[PDB]
Recover the amino acids of this structure.
DNA sequence: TGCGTTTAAGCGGTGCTAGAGCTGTCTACGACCAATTGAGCGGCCTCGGCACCGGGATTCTCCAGGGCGGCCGCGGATGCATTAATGC
DNA sequence: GCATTAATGCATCCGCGGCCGCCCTGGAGAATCCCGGTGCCGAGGCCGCTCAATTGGTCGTAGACAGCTCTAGCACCGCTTAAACGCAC
């Protein structure tokens, strides 16, 4: 007989795995390409150091995870598990934007 | 008070207005607007100050 | 047949009246005695003037009206009008406290 | 949630050059002090803008009477029970 | 004296009918806007003061100018897995 886990049960174990891990979830090449695109449409002929990129991605994942518990709290306030657009919009409005 | 003053300005609805001592000290703004001929005080020993 | 306004009709007009008006909504003497008694425990023999109180009053009601506004936003996000405990709890949590 | 695959980062390594980083030099260039006067400022007393209420035109909300398909009070039957004059 | 049988007081089970409440239309009344109307008071223009912004000179001093040094960013090359995408229930 096949062994299929109930939906969402794998979610708890992947949450457990990701909570103990401090590594970044974004590959270096797409992030660097996006930053270089911002430079390209920002100022022509710009150079990037090997450093000054870790701070970018680090601040981004910190901001993203923070906004994620804010939107999770907003969603659980709505008496539902699934997040939606109003949740993230309300979280952004209340946080100071 | 507003009801009594709804015909206060334009017509001659009253030939005499009777007011208490402690209501003028609250409605000076409305009272001083109208022109009067005779104004009388009773037991002026209170206003002696 | 007495004339009675249906509930909620007068609420809109109080909102309209108060939104166009900028006067203090807290009685002066209760606020000043509150301030005196809360300053008592920190250190005795306080001294407050006519000023140095209206500033606290104004900061307080501005903070409170802001809190009520985003509480309204949260309650609207909850698909209802009546405010409730958890509304002000998560408004306080989200705003930075 | 689970699977086949495919587009693709991670990684080991190079040659450089545009570019970051440390160093004399003088040359603009401001820090500091007599000296002044002139604009910023303390005080004052007034009229014009402002505060608050009046009179209606206007705008807004909110009341009740009237025509729509179902009703719960009643009366009688005519059976259940009682009852009194009479044959036995 | 006892059964008895027709006269009589209800017996309780429906038949019927008195019994309303909802939408749509009828204006009715409270609230608002808005400037006169006059009293109030403070904003500010004017008068007199005073102190620091400006002027010039003295004098020393930090930064642009190269000038040079060296250094890692990048564009490039090719292997090794490796998650992502589309699909399907």
């Amino acid at each position: 007989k096949p062994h299929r886990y109930k939906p969402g049960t794998v979610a708890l174990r992947e949450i457990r795995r990701f909570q103990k891990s401090t590594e970044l979830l974004i590959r270096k090449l797409p992030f660097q390409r996006l930053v270089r695109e911002i430079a390209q449409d920002f100022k022509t002929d710009l150079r990037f150091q090997s450093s000054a990129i870790g701070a970018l991605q680090e601040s981004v994942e910190a901001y993203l995870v923070s906004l994620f518990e804010d939107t999770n709290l907003a969603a659980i306030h709505a008496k539902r598990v699934t997040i939606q657009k109003k949740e993230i919009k309300l979280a952004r409005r209340l946080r100071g934007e | 008070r507003k009801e009594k003053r709804k015909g206060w300005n334009k017509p001659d609805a009253f030939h005499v207005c009777i007011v208490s001592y402690q209501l003028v000290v609250q409605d000076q703004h409305s009272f001083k607007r109208k022109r009067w001929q005779y104004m009388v005080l009773d037991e002026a020993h209170n206003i002696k100050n």
Remarks:
- Residues 27, 47-50 of chain A lie near DNA strand E (CB under 10 Å from a C1').
- Chains A and B do not touch (no CB pair under 8 Å).
- The two ends of chain A are 52 Å apart (CA to CA).
